[PDB]
Design a protein around this ligand. Structure first.
Ligand SMILES: Nc1ncnc2c1ncn2[C@@H]1O[C@H](COP(=O)(O)CP(=O)(O)OP(=O)(O)O)[C@@H](O)[C@H]1O
Ligand SMILES: [Mg+2]
Length: 157
């Protein structure tokens, strides 16, 4: 299990799932959500991540989406985007694998959805407890895709 080897077994993935307070299923489209309240919730997720001790103990590169980056991503996708498709990356990790084969087997699990992309390249894995929790993003990248991604960063930004 590539996830269990990295630290991200199901108990950890579950205790990392932030339970929304917005009363809204994340299968609804952005049109149904109160932007003022969403942004507040992101502030609280921010505060919650910067106090977690289990992320410290994890051998992983991690990032929380800032309230400013969520606000941009919200307006960029309003009104007809699904919420669990836009805000599927609020908490995110980045790892390198020796191969992609064993990553694409995570599709066959429950609660794990996989988005293959092998300008850029790589494989994104999403754990979502249920439809009123935020999904955790995991970007996988062999050395071949990680150096192409980093090199494209230099000629873009
Ligand atoms: N899953 C991740 N794990 C670790 N670092 C990440 C991850 N995703 C993004 N980052 C880094 O954090 C920066 C900020 O990401 P961001 O502000 O949330 C927009 P980003 O996720 O890169 O693209 P969108 O998903 O389209 O908004 C990125 O430019 C990366 O350097
Ligand atoms: Mg992202």
């Amino acid at each position: 299990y590539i996830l269990d080897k990295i630290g991200l077994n199901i108990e950890i993935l579950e205790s990392l799932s932030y339970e929304s307070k917005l009363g809204m299923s994340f299968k609804r489209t952005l049109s149904h959500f109160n932007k003022e309240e969403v942004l507040k919730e992101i502030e609280l997720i921010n505060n919650w991540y910067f106090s977690l001790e289990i992320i410290d103990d994890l051998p992983l590169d991690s990032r929380i989406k800032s309230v400013s980056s969520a606000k941009m991503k919200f307006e960029r996708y309003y009104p007809n985007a699904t919420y669990n498709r836009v805000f599927n990356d609020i908490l995110g990790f980045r790892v390198i694998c020796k191969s992609y084969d064993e990553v694409l087997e995570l599709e066959k699990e429950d609660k794990i959805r996989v988005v293959d992309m092998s300008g850029f390249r790589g494989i994104h894995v999403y754990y979502q407890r249920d439809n009123h929790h935020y999904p955790i993003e995991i970007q996988f990248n062999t050395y071949y895709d990680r150096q192409l991604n980093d090199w494209l960063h230099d000629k873009f930004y």
